[PDB]
Design a protein around this ligand. Structure first.
Ligand code: UWV
Ligand code: UWV
Lengths: 264, 265
């Protein structure tokens, strides 16, 4: 991969792997979400960042995902080359936004797009902190100054408030626990695992007859390595679902989201 | 990737990803095992296979892994390029053997190696069968004629018989179930998931203080999508060795047995 000519975004090509595809021989949404974080990390590395921290290391400050919104028009097939461009932007003292555009390397057509909201927090106390002033200046030289949005439509799906699922859930997948392949290099559960756990409560008939078009996911609390998760789903409708991930025990909320699916 | 000059093996380079590494910032054994199957798949596609033949597809025959043996000397770090060469060989009517050599792309040094035993089975009845001569001839033109082994040693670990773990197991990880990311394109559990399930019953102190050097895994039965698995481990041993058993949580039906060797970091 490489930074673009202006140095304000990063591009990278990926060839879709055999173990990365689902039953329709096209890349899963978890493979797409993993490629999004891989190009995000390479963008950070190329411009001198680590959680993508700056001098926040001495203050014990990290970047954490609050929301992830993915929209896929065409899933790349096994053997296809997919090119992904990513960039960040400051959104005031609330946090930063990272966006992505996914294209077909051959035709040059947009096959997908994603946007994510990130907040600053203290890694130890887990307390959210508003983005200071001299931390803002450190990142600004790597972001476009004019707004550049993957989801430009004012008041779009990525900015829509998500409600809390009411019991009883229509569908459920209980006793979900992470294994070592679900942990990142810092032994925390990978953000991508939570996407798979949400999709576990979608009935197989929906997965077999439909294709996932949109996914919006709020990250309210992290699931520890020794935690057990319940995945809940209710149809709100194309097919739409409201989702909730919570601790199997006391029912403490870890995620809430929505998915939109289209008939194949 | 590409077939070598003689067309009897296939090479491919992989750059290690951020989400592919463990706590010590090096590629996990599950990442390595996934790259081994990816180059195996690309070798098959380059020579006109699915890895079944049109003769095998009309008979509903498939190749299935009976045993996987991996030995890693140095795990590639995040950002490193690793080159893998793979080739197959007929082992008579019992089945085929697929081998791998993993090298550092920069220094050219061997950082790992693997060998797997594959048998033929009817897709539907799950009944095994010895390889027919017309099927044997179809693959022979893609394999070296002289023996070419990743594990040539007189007394090598890849061909040792594995015993059955006796209850009570020293350690256990109960209620393991596969999710959709654990299924392959044919909705079967990926062979790599079984490796992760075996390693789940290794205590975290071992994982944190040691590095996995060797893993031998027998595949006895398949885990269905709706099945629940128990992972059992007992220390059999500076080096640390373990005997492993995967079985259905309910009736205790065996699905895997294996051994792992670990060395102090
Ligand atoms: F890694 C970067 C490259 C260019 C501009 C900004 C960053 N970091 C900010 C950030 C927060 C969450 N992801 N990225
Ligand atoms: F796919 C191949 C390429 C070249 C020679 C042989 C094969 N197939 C045999 C095989 C592979 C795994 N199990 N059995």
């Amino acid at each position: 991969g490489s930074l673009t000519e202006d140095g304000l975004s990063y591009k990278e090509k990926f060839v879709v792997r055999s173990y990365e595809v689902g039953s329709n021989k096209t890349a899963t949404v978890e493979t797409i979400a993993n490629l999004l974080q891989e190009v995000g990390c390479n963008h950070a590395q190329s411009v001198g960042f680590s959680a993508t921290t700056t001098t926040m290391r001495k203050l014990h400050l990290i970047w954490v995902t609050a929301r992830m919104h993915i929209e896929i028009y065409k899933y790349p097939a096994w053997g296809d080359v997919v090119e992904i461009e990513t960039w960040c932007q400051s959104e005031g003292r609330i946090g930063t936004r990272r966006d992505w555009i996914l294209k077909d390397s051959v035709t040059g057509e947009v096959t997908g797009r994603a946007t994510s909201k990130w907040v600053m927090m203290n890694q130890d106390t887990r307390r959210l902190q508003k983005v200071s002033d001299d931390v803002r200046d450190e990142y600004l030289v790597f972001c476009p100054q004019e707004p550049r949005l993957a989801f430009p439509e004012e008041n779009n799906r990525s900015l829509k408030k998500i409600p809390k699922l009411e019991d009883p859930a229509q569908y459920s997948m209980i006793g979900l626990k992470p294994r070592r392949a679900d942990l990142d290099m810092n032994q925390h559960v990978n953000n991508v695992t939570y996407i798979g756990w949400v999709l576990e409560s979608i009935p197989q008939e929906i997965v077999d007859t439909h294709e996932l078009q949109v996914i919006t996911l709020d990250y309210r609390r992290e699931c520890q390595q020794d935690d057990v998760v319940d995945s809940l789903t209710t149809t709100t409708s194309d097919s739409q679902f409201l989702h909730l991930l919570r601790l199997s025990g006391d029912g403490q909320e870890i995620n809430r989201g929505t998915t939109l699916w289209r008939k194949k």
